[PDB]
Amino acid sequence: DNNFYSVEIGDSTFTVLKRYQNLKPIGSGAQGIVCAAYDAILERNVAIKKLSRPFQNQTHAKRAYRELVLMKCVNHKNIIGLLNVFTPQKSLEEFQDVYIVMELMDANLCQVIQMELDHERMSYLLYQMLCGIKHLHSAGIIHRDLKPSNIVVKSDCTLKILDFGLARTAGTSFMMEPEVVTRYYRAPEVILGMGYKENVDIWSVGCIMGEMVCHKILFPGRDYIDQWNKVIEQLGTPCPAFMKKLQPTVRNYVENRPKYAGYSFEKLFPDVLFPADSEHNKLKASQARDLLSKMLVIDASKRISVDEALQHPYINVWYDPSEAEAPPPKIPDKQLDEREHTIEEWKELIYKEVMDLE
Protein backbone atom coordinates (compact mmCIF):
# COMPACT_ATOMS: atom_id res chain seq x y z
CA ASP A 1 0.00 0.00 0.00
CA ASN A 2 2.52 2.60 -1.14
CA ASN A 3 1.52 5.22 -3.74
CA PHE A 4 -0.14 2.82 -6.15
CA TYR A 5 -3.14 0.53 -5.93
CA SER A 6 -4.18 -1.72 -8.80
CA VAL A 7 -7.42 -2.68 -10.59
CA GLU A 8 -8.70 -5.21 -13.10
CA ILE A 9 -9.47 -3.13 -16.18
CA GLY A 10 -11.40 -5.57 -18.31
CA ASP A 11 -8.61 -7.99 -19.21
CA SER A 12 -5.49 -6.08 -18.09
CA THR A 13 -4.34 -4.89 -14.63
CA PHE A 14 -3.68 -1.13 -14.20
CA THR A 15 -1.26 -0.48 -11.34
CA VAL A 16 -1.56 3.26 -10.77
CA LEU A 17 -1.10 6.22 -8.42
CA LYS A 18 -3.73 6.89 -5.80
CA ARG A 19 -4.66 10.34 -7.11
CA TYR A 20 -6.28 8.51 -10.03
CA GLN A 21 -9.67 7.04 -9.07
CA ASN A 22 -12.64 5.16 -10.58
CA LEU A 23 -10.90 4.10 -13.78
CA LYS A 24 -13.42 2.38 -16.15
CA PRO A 25 -12.09 1.50 -19.70
CA ILE A 26 -12.89 3.63 -22.77
CA GLY A 27 -10.53 2.59 -25.52
CA SER A 28 -8.73 -0.59 -26.50
CA GLY A 29 -6.26 0.06 -29.34
CA ALA A 30 -3.32 -1.26 -31.38
CA GLN A 31 -0.96 0.71 -29.09
CA GLY A 32 -2.53 0.86 -25.59
CA ILE A 33 -5.46 0.39 -23.22
CA VAL A 34 -6.95 3.72 -22.15
CA CYS A 35 -9.26 4.48 -19.25
CA ALA A 36 -11.29 7.41 -17.95
CA ALA A 37 -10.52 8.49 -14.42
CA TYR A 38 -10.98 11.04 -11.73
CA ASP A 39 -7.85 12.80 -10.47
CA ALA A 40 -8.34 13.92 -6.85
CA ILE A 41 -5.31 16.17 -6.78
CA LEU A 42 -6.55 18.01 -9.88
CA GLU A 43 -10.28 17.37 -9.32
CA ARG A 44 -11.32 16.84 -12.90
CA ASN A 45 -11.53 13.64 -14.88
CA VAL A 46 -8.49 12.49 -16.81
CA ALA A 47 -7.47 9.84 -19.32
CA ILE A 48 -4.95 7.11 -18.61
CA LYS A 49 -3.20 4.99 -21.18
CA LYS A 50 -1.12 1.95 -20.39
CA LEU A 51 1.36 1.51 -23.20
CA SER A 52 0.47 -2.13 -24.01
CA ARG A 53 3.81 -3.99 -24.40
CA PRO A 54 6.46 -1.28 -24.77
CA PHE A 55 9.19 -3.86 -25.33
CA GLN A 56 8.15 -6.97 -27.16
CA ASN A 57 10.22 -5.38 -29.96
CA GLN A 58 12.24 -2.53 -31.42
CA THR A 59 9.14 -1.45 -33.32
CA HIS A 60 6.91 -0.99 -30.25
CA ALA A 61 9.80 0.57 -28.41
CA LYS A 62 10.49 3.43 -30.80
CA ARG A 63 6.77 3.92 -31.04
CA ALA A 64 6.45 4.25 -27.28
CA TYR A 65 9.49 6.56 -26.97
CA ARG A 66 8.09 8.80 -29.71
CA GLU A 67 4.67 9.10 -28.08
CA LEU A 68 6.49 10.16 -24.88
CA VAL A 69 8.78 12.73 -26.46
CA LEU A 70 6.07 14.12 -28.68
CA MET A 71 3.41 14.40 -25.98
CA LYS A 72 5.97 16.52 -24.09
CA CYS A 73 7.34 18.72 -26.89
CA VAL A 74 4.29 19.44 -28.99
CA ASN A 75 1.78 21.82 -27.44
CA HIS A 76 -1.02 23.64 -29.20
CA LYS A 77 -4.65 24.26 -28.35
CA ASN A 78 -5.57 21.51 -30.80
CA ILE A 79 -3.13 18.85 -29.60
CA ILE A 80 -4.12 16.66 -26.60
CA GLY A 81 -2.45 17.97 -23.46
CA LEU A 82 -0.02 15.79 -21.52
CA LEU A 83 -0.98 15.87 -17.85
CA ASN A 84 1.25 13.21 -16.27
CA VAL A 85 3.33 10.08 -17.01
CA PHE A 86 4.75 7.48 -14.60
CA THR A 87 5.73 3.83 -13.96
CA PRO A 88 4.93 1.66 -10.95
CA GLN A 89 8.23 -0.19 -11.22
CA LYS A 90 11.05 0.89 -8.86
CA SER A 91 14.30 0.31 -10.81
CA LEU A 92 15.41 0.27 -14.42
CA GLU A 93 15.83 -3.45 -13.77
CA GLU A 94 12.26 -3.87 -12.54
CA PHE A 95 11.04 -1.29 -15.13
CA GLN A 96 8.32 -2.76 -17.29
CA ASP A 97 5.33 -0.44 -17.80
CA VAL A 98 4.55 3.12 -18.77
CA TYR A 99 1.40 5.07 -17.94
CA ILE A 100 0.44 8.22 -19.81
CA VAL A 101 -2.14 10.50 -18.26
CA MET A 102 -3.68 13.20 -20.40
CA GLU A 103 -6.73 15.38 -20.98
CA LEU A 104 -10.06 13.67 -21.20
CA MET A 105 -12.51 15.19 -23.68
CA ASP A 106 -16.21 14.30 -24.06
CA ALA A 107 -16.27 12.24 -27.23
CA ASN A 108 -14.97 10.91 -30.53
CA LEU A 109 -15.38 12.25 -34.04
CA CYS A 110 -17.10 8.87 -34.48
CA GLN A 111 -19.69 10.53 -32.34
CA VAL A 112 -19.79 13.69 -34.48
CA ILE A 113 -20.11 11.51 -37.54
CA GLN A 114 -23.38 10.35 -35.98
CA MET A 115 -25.09 13.71 -36.01
CA GLU A 116 -26.28 16.43 -38.39
CA LEU A 117 -24.00 19.50 -38.41
CA ASP A 118 -24.50 23.10 -39.62
CA HIS A 119 -21.93 24.82 -41.77
CA GLU A 120 -20.40 26.66 -38.83
CA ARG A 121 -19.79 23.59 -36.73
CA MET A 122 -18.49 21.47 -39.57
CA SER A 123 -16.32 24.19 -41.01
CA TYR A 124 -15.02 25.04 -37.54
CA LEU A 125 -14.22 21.49 -36.48
CA LEU A 126 -12.14 21.03 -39.68
CA TYR A 127 -10.32 24.29 -39.06
CA GLN A 128 -9.30 23.22 -35.57
CA MET A 129 -8.28 19.86 -36.91
CA LEU A 130 -6.19 21.48 -39.64
CA CYS A 131 -4.57 23.86 -37.09
CA GLY A 132 -3.44 20.90 -35.08
CA ILE A 133 -2.02 19.05 -38.04
CA LYS A 134 -0.41 22.25 -39.24
CA HIS A 135 1.37 22.51 -35.91
CA LEU A 136 2.85 19.05 -36.45
CA HIS A 137 3.81 19.73 -40.05
CA SER A 138 5.58 22.95 -39.15
CA ALA A 139 8.09 20.67 -37.38
CA GLY A 140 8.14 18.26 -40.32
CA ILE A 141 6.30 15.77 -38.11
CA ILE A 142 3.69 13.68 -39.88
CA HIS A 143 0.92 12.04 -37.94
CA ARG A 144 0.22 8.98 -40.14
CA ASP A 145 -2.68 7.57 -38.09
CA LEU A 146 -5.40 10.21 -38.42
CA LYS A 147 -8.88 8.70 -38.08
CA PRO A 148 -12.19 9.45 -36.36
CA SER A 149 -11.19 7.95 -33.03
CA ASN A 150 -7.98 9.95 -32.83
CA ILE A 151 -9.82 13.25 -33.03
CA VAL A 152 -11.58 14.23 -29.81
CA VAL A 153 -14.09 16.91 -28.90
CA LYS A 154 -15.64 18.80 -25.99
CA SER A 155 -19.24 19.97 -25.60
CA ASP A 156 -18.10 23.57 -26.23
CA CYS A 157 -17.10 22.58 -29.77
CA THR A 158 -13.35 22.37 -29.25
CA LEU A 159 -11.20 19.73 -30.93
CA LYS A 160 -7.79 18.20 -30.24
CA ILE A 161 -5.73 15.70 -32.19
CA LEU A 162 -4.37 12.78 -30.21
CA ASP A 163 -2.10 9.69 -30.52
CA PHE A 164 1.46 10.18 -31.69
CA GLY A 165 3.12 6.78 -31.64
CA LEU A 166 3.05 6.43 -35.41
CA ALA A 167 4.16 10.00 -35.75
CA ARG A 168 7.40 10.71 -37.50
CA THR A 169 9.26 12.49 -40.25
CA ALA A 170 8.79 12.00 -44.03
CA GLY A 171 10.56 9.27 -46.11
CA THR A 172 9.97 5.56 -46.99
CA SER A 173 6.48 4.22 -46.22
CA PHE A 174 7.65 0.75 -45.21
CA MET A 175 6.29 0.36 -41.71
CA MET A 176 6.18 -2.65 -39.43
CA GLU A 177 2.82 -4.05 -38.42
CA PRO A 178 0.96 -1.79 -40.93
CA GLU A 179 -2.05 -3.41 -39.33
CA VAL A 180 -1.71 -0.62 -36.77
CA VAL A 181 -3.09 2.01 -39.13
CA THR A 182 -6.80 1.62 -39.94
CA ARG A 183 -7.14 0.94 -43.67
CA TYR A 184 -10.17 2.95 -44.65
CA TYR A 185 -7.91 5.95 -44.09
CA ARG A 186 -4.67 4.78 -45.72
CA ALA A 187 -3.50 7.17 -48.43
CA PRO A 188 -2.71 5.87 -51.93
CA GLU A 189 0.97 6.46 -51.27
CA VAL A 190 0.83 4.44 -48.07
CA ILE A 191 -1.10 1.65 -49.78
CA LEU A 192 1.13 1.35 -52.85
CA GLY A 193 4.31 1.64 -50.84
CA MET A 194 5.43 4.91 -52.41
CA GLY A 195 7.13 7.67 -50.49
CA TYR A 196 5.12 10.05 -48.35
CA LYS A 197 5.38 13.71 -47.41
CA GLU A 198 3.35 15.84 -45.01
CA ASN A 199 0.24 15.91 -47.16
CA VAL A 200 -0.26 12.20 -46.63
CA ASP A 201 -2.24 13.42 -43.60
CA ILE A 202 -4.47 15.59 -45.77
CA TRP A 203 -5.77 12.47 -47.51
CA SER A 204 -7.00 11.23 -44.12
CA VAL A 205 -8.59 14.60 -43.48
CA GLY A 206 -10.35 14.09 -46.77
CA CYS A 207 -11.53 10.61 -45.86
CA ILE A 208 -12.77 11.88 -42.55
CA MET A 209 -14.59 14.98 -43.80
CA GLY A 210 -16.17 12.69 -46.36
CA GLU A 211 -17.46 10.45 -43.61
CA MET A 212 -18.86 13.45 -41.76
CA VAL A 213 -20.82 14.45 -44.84
CA CYS A 214 -21.89 10.96 -45.83
CA HIS A 215 -21.98 9.32 -42.41
CA LYS A 216 -20.81 6.08 -43.98
CA ILE A 217 -17.19 5.14 -44.45
CA LEU A 218 -15.92 6.54 -47.74
CA PHE A 219 -13.71 3.78 -49.10
CA PRO A 220 -14.88 0.63 -47.33
CA GLY A 221 -12.70 -2.24 -48.40
CA ARG A 222 -12.41 -5.77 -47.21
CA ASP A 223 -8.63 -6.10 -47.01
CA TYR A 224 -5.36 -4.29 -47.56
CA ILE A 225 -5.49 -4.79 -51.31
CA ASP A 226 -9.24 -4.31 -51.83
CA GLN A 227 -8.71 -0.90 -50.29
CA TRP A 228 -7.16 0.14 -53.61
CA ASN A 229 -10.06 -1.25 -55.62
CA LYS A 230 -12.39 0.94 -53.54
CA VAL A 231 -10.41 4.11 -54.11
CA ILE A 232 -10.16 3.84 -57.88
CA GLU A 233 -13.76 2.79 -58.28
CA GLN A 234 -14.73 6.06 -56.63
CA LEU A 235 -11.89 8.37 -57.70
CA GLY A 236 -10.92 6.87 -61.01
CA THR A 237 -7.91 4.92 -62.24
CA PRO A 238 -4.91 7.19 -61.89
CA CYS A 239 -3.01 8.61 -64.90
CA PRO A 240 0.19 7.06 -66.34
CA ALA A 241 2.43 9.78 -64.89
CA PHE A 242 1.55 8.35 -61.44
CA MET A 243 1.90 4.62 -62.34
CA LYS A 244 5.42 5.42 -63.48
CA LYS A 245 6.21 6.34 -59.84
CA LEU A 246 5.24 2.96 -58.45
CA GLN A 247 7.63 0.21 -57.42
CA PRO A 248 8.12 -2.19 -60.34
CA THR A 249 6.37 -5.02 -58.45
CA VAL A 250 3.39 -2.87 -57.50
CA ARG A 251 3.14 -0.84 -60.70
CA ASN A 252 2.50 -3.96 -62.77
CA TYR A 253 -0.41 -5.01 -60.54
CA VAL A 254 -1.90 -1.50 -60.63
CA GLU A 255 -1.80 -1.45 -64.43
CA ASN A 256 -3.56 -4.79 -64.71
CA ARG A 257 -6.49 -3.53 -62.67
CA PRO A 258 -9.75 -2.81 -64.47
CA LYS A 259 -10.09 0.74 -65.73
CA TYR A 260 -12.40 3.03 -63.75
CA ALA A 261 -13.62 6.42 -64.78
CA GLY A 262 -14.55 7.24 -61.20
CA TYR A 263 -17.57 9.33 -60.25
CA SER A 264 -17.95 13.10 -60.06
CA PHE A 265 -17.69 14.86 -56.76
CA GLU A 266 -21.40 15.60 -56.79
CA LYS A 267 -22.57 12.07 -57.30
CA LEU A 268 -20.01 11.23 -54.69
CA PHE A 269 -21.22 14.11 -52.51
CA PRO A 270 -24.68 15.34 -53.44
CA ASP A 271 -25.84 18.56 -51.70
CA VAL A 272 -28.50 16.90 -49.55
CA LEU A 273 -25.68 15.28 -47.58
CA PHE A 274 -23.98 18.61 -46.78
CA PRO A 275 -25.18 20.96 -44.03
CA ALA A 276 -28.19 23.06 -45.03
CA ASP A 277 -27.15 25.99 -47.17
CA SER A 278 -27.79 29.62 -46.21
CA GLU A 279 -27.22 32.69 -48.36
CA HIS A 280 -23.49 32.86 -47.47
CA ASN A 281 -20.75 32.41 -50.03
CA LYS A 282 -18.09 30.75 -47.91
CA LEU A 283 -20.02 28.26 -45.80
CA LYS A 284 -21.75 26.73 -48.85
CA ALA A 285 -21.86 23.00 -49.70
CA SER A 286 -20.05 23.70 -52.98
CA GLN A 287 -17.09 25.28 -51.22
CA ALA A 288 -16.96 22.32 -48.91
CA ARG A 289 -17.16 19.89 -51.82
CA ASP A 290 -14.44 21.85 -53.54
CA LEU A 291 -12.16 21.36 -50.53
CA LEU A 292 -12.92 17.64 -50.54
CA SER A 293 -12.08 17.43 -54.22
CA LYS A 294 -8.67 18.88 -53.39
CA MET A 295 -7.87 16.39 -50.63
CA LEU A 296 -9.30 13.22 -52.13
CA VAL A 297 -6.67 13.39 -54.84
CA ILE A 298 -4.70 10.18 -55.45
CA ASP A 299 -1.47 11.56 -56.85
CA ALA A 300 -0.11 13.27 -53.74
CA SER A 301 1.81 15.82 -55.79
CA LYS A 302 -1.46 17.35 -56.88
CA ARG A 303 -3.08 17.06 -53.50
CA ILE A 304 -3.72 20.14 -51.37
CA SER A 305 -1.32 21.01 -48.51
CA VAL A 306 -2.28 21.98 -44.97
CA ASP A 307 -1.47 25.62 -45.62
CA GLU A 308 -3.63 25.80 -48.78
CA ALA A 309 -6.30 23.98 -46.76
CA LEU A 310 -6.36 26.66 -44.07
CA GLN A 311 -6.59 29.29 -46.83
CA HIS A 312 -9.65 27.65 -48.42
CA PRO A 313 -12.89 29.73 -48.41
CA TYR A 314 -14.76 27.04 -46.48
CA ILE A 315 -12.21 26.94 -43.68
CA ASN A 316 -10.75 30.41 -43.89
CA VAL A 317 -13.58 32.27 -42.16
CA TRP A 318 -11.99 31.33 -38.85
CA TYR A 319 -8.34 31.94 -39.75
CA ASP A 320 -6.34 33.36 -36.86
CA PRO A 321 -2.55 33.68 -37.05
CA SER A 322 -2.17 32.66 -33.41
CA GLU A 323 -3.60 29.18 -34.14
CA ALA A 324 -2.74 28.70 -37.79
CA GLU A 325 0.83 30.03 -37.59
CA ALA A 326 1.85 29.25 -34.05
CA PRO A 327 5.62 29.08 -33.67
CA PRO A 328 6.74 25.48 -34.42
CA PRO A 329 7.35 22.94 -31.74
CA LYS A 330 11.00 22.16 -31.03
CA ILE A 331 12.28 18.72 -30.20
CA PRO A 332 15.52 18.10 -28.21
CA ASP A 333 17.14 15.84 -30.96
CA LYS A 334 15.98 12.60 -29.27
CA GLN A 335 13.67 12.11 -32.24
CA LEU A 336 16.46 13.18 -34.59
CA ASP A 337 17.81 9.93 -33.01
CA GLU A 338 15.66 7.92 -35.57
CA ARG A 339 18.42 5.32 -35.15
CA GLU A 340 17.76 1.68 -34.32
CA HIS A 341 18.94 0.62 -30.84
CA THR A 342 18.39 -2.79 -29.19
CA ILE A 343 15.38 -3.74 -27.06
CA GLU A 344 17.60 -3.16 -24.01
CA GLU A 345 19.02 0.20 -25.07
CA TRP A 346 15.35 1.16 -25.64
CA LYS A 347 14.36 0.14 -22.14
CA GLU A 348 17.17 2.60 -21.26
CA LEU A 349 15.89 5.65 -23.16
CA ILE A 350 12.32 4.98 -22.11
CA TYR A 351 13.07 4.60 -18.40
CA LYS A 352 15.00 7.83 -18.53
CA GLU A 353 12.28 9.75 -20.35
CA VAL A 354 9.66 8.47 -17.91
CA MET A 355 11.79 9.37 -14.86
CA ASP A 356 12.82 12.89 -15.91
CA LEU A 357 9.22 13.48 -17.09
CA GLU A 358 7.39 12.36 -13.95
Partner: peptide, 10 residues
Protein backbone atom coordinates in the same frame (compact mmCIF):
# COMPACT_ATOMS: atom_id res chain seq x y z
CA UNK B 1 -19.51 34.77 -38.41
CA UNK B 2 -18.86 33.88 -34.73
CA UNK B 3 -17.18 30.66 -33.54
CA UNK B 4 -19.68 28.13 -32.21
CA UNK B 5 -19.58 27.51 -28.47
CA UNK B 6 -21.74 24.42 -28.14
CA UNK B 7 -21.91 20.93 -29.67
CA UNK B 8 -24.73 18.52 -28.74
CA UNK B 9 -22.89 15.24 -28.47
CA UNK B 10 -25.87 13.59 -26.85
Amino acid sequence: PKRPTTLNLF
